[PDB]
């Protein structure tokens, strides 16, 4: 449940952040921060699987 809810809310946050600014091909700093945090969640799940 931790995993599913974290991933779901993270996807919702990622969608929400993009609407604040116009459609741009490049990636903003906000996008990099969100991607890194999403990677941290994914890494937590990977460490779960390893253990």
């Amino acid at each position: 449940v931790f995993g599913v809810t974290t991933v779901l809310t993270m996807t919702t946050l990622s969608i929400s952040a993009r609407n604040s600014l116009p459609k741009v091909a490049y990636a903003t700093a906000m996008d990099w921060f969100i991607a890194v945090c999403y990677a941290f969640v994914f890494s937590a799940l990977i460490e779960f699987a390893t253990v």
Binding site: L8, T11, T12, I15
Partner: protein, 52 residues
């Protein structure tokens, strides 16, 4: 997946045919559906042939 679909839906107009993005999202929906049905199948026959 439904959240992604609705957010995509609002931006676009109401066109009859099927778009490429719609084809991809439908494919992903089918993948998730088949995963859930596969779990249901596993749970259905487990008592008789758990090794299966």
């Amino acid at each position: 997946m439904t959240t992604i679909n609705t957010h995509l839906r609002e931006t676009l107009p109401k066109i009859p045919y099927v778009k490429a993005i719609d084809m991809y999202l439908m494919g992903c929906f089918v993948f998730v559906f088949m995963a859930l049905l596969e779990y249901a199948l596993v749970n259905y026959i487990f008592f008789s042939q758990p090794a299966r």
